[PDB]
Structure formats: C-alpha cells, structure tokens
Design a protein around this ligand. Structure first.
Ligand SMILES: Cc1nc2cc(Cl)c(NS(=O)(=O)c3cccc(Cl)c3O)cc2s1
Length: 351
C-alpha cells in the first residue's frame, strides 16, 4: 500500500463518512493494474459487525454494467443483435407502438419514455406482458434518453432468451465464473448471509425488496474484492481468455448516444478524459444524438456508473488509458455528487 494511495484515500474518505453519516464503507483503488483495499465502520450496527474485504454490498444500478456486458456477450455469440426488433424475442408484444423499438433502444434508455420503475403490482410474466403492451411512448424511438429500470431490465431478460438459460444462470456461467467473481450474487446464499451488510435508511436496517426485473436492473450484491476484479476486467478486456466475453466488455463501452458531455454505453456511461469534475432529479428527459456508427471503446475516457438501493450507495469509475480505477461501496444511499467528488479527488491525485 503505497503511502500516496493511503494518504489520498484516507484524507478524502474519512471526512466523507463523517459528513454523510455513512455507517460502513469499502473502497478499492486500482493503480497501474494492482488493487488496494480500505474499509471503515459497520456492516451491521446492531450486531457490531465490521466492514471487511468480504462484506457484501447491494450494488443497485451498478448491476446494469453486468447486464450490459452480458448482453454484449450474447451479441458476440451471435445469439442476438442490437438492431433486432424487440418483438423478435417477444412475439407476444403485439401492440403497434413497439414497431421500430429495437434491443439497442431498450439497452440505452432511448425506446421513447419507458418509466424509471416497474410498478410494484407487476409480478408475473403475464403481468409484465400486460405492462409493456399498455405502455404509451411519449416520443419516437431513438430521440430522447430517459433513465429507466424497465428499459434495460427488459433488455436483459430478452438478451438471454436464445441461450435457453435463466438470467441468473447466464450471468453466473458467462460472466461471474469466467472472471472468478466467486462472491458476487443475484441471490445471496444462506452460507454467505454472515457477510451481507445491512443497508440503512432513516436509521433503519433494510435490504432490497424483490421486484419484477430486479435481477436485470439492480439485483447484484458483491464484495470490494470482486468489484476490484470487475474494474480490472473492464480496464483490460484483452487479458480475458473467453473471446465472446472480451468482445462483450468492449461492446458495453462503445459510445451509442451523446447527450451533453456524456456518452451512453451498455450499462456503462462515459465521458472524454480529461474530464471537468463539474461535468461529472426524479426524471430527467434529454434529447440524444445518435453516434452513427457507435464509437468503439475509447481508452481515454472516464467510464463510470452510480448505483443505489433504499439502503445502499455505490460508485465505480475507471480510466483505461491510465490503468486507473476506483470502487466505493457504502451502506447508506448518500448524494451522487459527493461520490463523484471523492472519486475525482482520488483519481486526479493519482493520475
Ligand atoms: C429511496 C430509494 N429506493 C431505491 C430502490 C432501488 Cl432498487 C434503487 N435502485 S435503481 O436501480 O432503481 C436506481 C434508480 C435511479 C438511480 C440509481 Cl443510481 C439507481 O440505482 C434505488 C432506490 S432509491
């Protein structure tokens, strides 16, 4: 643990934890390709269990990066194409508004205003069909971006249908296992419950509740060690031996749409490096410019994703051209600007 990394991390994170009243936190810094770990505070306040390198945190929407990569892998296998109509994999979706909506639109939140949340009343496969049949787009496909669990979640469910595998089994066999993410779960097994942190909302201990498309949109739980490995894999995809997975990682970092200074990948979001830190709301509708054709993964990028659940707040950011990255996992959902500011202070100091 180089003293420079130790100092910048502790001097940034200790006051962050104090100002945001974060019960427990884990951080990983990837520096020239090697990981360094830091932990603070409590995974379980009532039982006085500390955060360790083996503590499981809810990733929330950082799960979408896994979904994006899994979709990329299915593309590289020739099982799906992003230019395919949604109805090719869901022929029961017969309502006319779906004409022209492709898997790419689902993956990138550009289908025309699919909502942020699947309603709680929607549980079954027939419930889901009915919800998507009744949905009325506000916009033509590929004209505006609206961040939505119901968009990329449906992409994830459809992308695995040609494989014959359940979404969870596809994610285990095709992403977690090849990358040796052996403590990363869509469903936490009983054997691992001792390591599953509690989230804290309004001082109450909480875990994410089941929902439709939860696995695909916000369902992953992981340790700081596995998340460091995830960052390493996304920094250097060419070191990965599985060919379609290497390609799927590259596809998830391609630039498909631009809004302002940001580019939309599959799960991942990207900005050009170096980034103005100030350049990095319940509903924010933004017009998008198509990138025709998509730009292949730009090594000189700030690639990132925020994530939240009711009780958890996560952030991942990395810069491929510098072999540099960071993961911040906390069991309180605290404001996104504070996450990005801390991450930028650390990475800027080290670059
Ligand atoms: C009071 C709250 N309850 C929940 C429950 C969940 Cl499941 C999520 N996760 S999310 O996938 O839908 C999500 C949505 C928008 C932004 C982010 Cl960064 C995110 O992760 C967030 C919150 S906030």
């Amino acid at each position: 643990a180089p003293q420079q990394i130790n100092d910048i991390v502790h001097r940034t994170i200790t006051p962050l934890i104090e100002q945001q009243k974060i019960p427990g936190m884990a951080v990983a810094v990837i520096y020239q390709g090697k990981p360094y770990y830091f932990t603070w505070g409590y995974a379980d306040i009532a039982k006085k269990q500390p955060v360790t390198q083996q503590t499981l945190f809810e990733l929330g929407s950082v799960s979408k990066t896994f979904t994006g990569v899994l979709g990329g892998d299915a593309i590289a296998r020739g099982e799906i194409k992003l230019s395919d109509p949604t109805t090719k994999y869901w022929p029961e979706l017969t309502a006319k508004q779906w004409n022209g909506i492709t898997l790419l639109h689902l993956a990138t939140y550009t289908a025309g205003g699919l909502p942020l949340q699947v309603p709680d009343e929607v549980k079954s496969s027939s419930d889901l069909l009915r919800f998507y049949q009744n949905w009325q787009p506000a916009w033509a496909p590929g004209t505006q971006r609206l961040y939505a669990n119901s968009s990329i979640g449906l992409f994830g469910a459809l992308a695995v249908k040609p494989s014959g595998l359940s979404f969870e089994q596809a994610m285990q066999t095709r992403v977690f296992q090849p990358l040796k993410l052996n403590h990363t779960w869509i469903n936490v097994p009983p054997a691992e419950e001792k390591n599953y942190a509690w989230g804290y909302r309004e001082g109450k201990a909480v875990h994410v509740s089941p929902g439709a498309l939860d696995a695909e949109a916000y369902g992953v739980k992981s340790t700081i060690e596995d998340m460091a490995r995830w960052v390493q894999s996304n920094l250097k995809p060419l070191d990965i031996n599985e060919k379609t997975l290497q390609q799927g990682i590259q596809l998830a970092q391609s630039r498909y749409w631009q809004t302002g200074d940001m580019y939309q990948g599959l799960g991942w979001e990207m900005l050009d490096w170096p980034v103005n830190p100030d350049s990095i709301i319940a509903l924010a509708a933004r017009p998008v410019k198509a990138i025709t054709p998509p730009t292949p993964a730009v090594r000189a990028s700030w690639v990132h994703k925020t994530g939240a659940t009711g009780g958890f707040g996560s952030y991942v950011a990395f810069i491929p051209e510098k072999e540099l990255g960071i993961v911040m996992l906390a069991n309180k959902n605290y404001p996104n600007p504070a996450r990005v500011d801390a991450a930028w202070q650390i990475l800027n100091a080290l670059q």
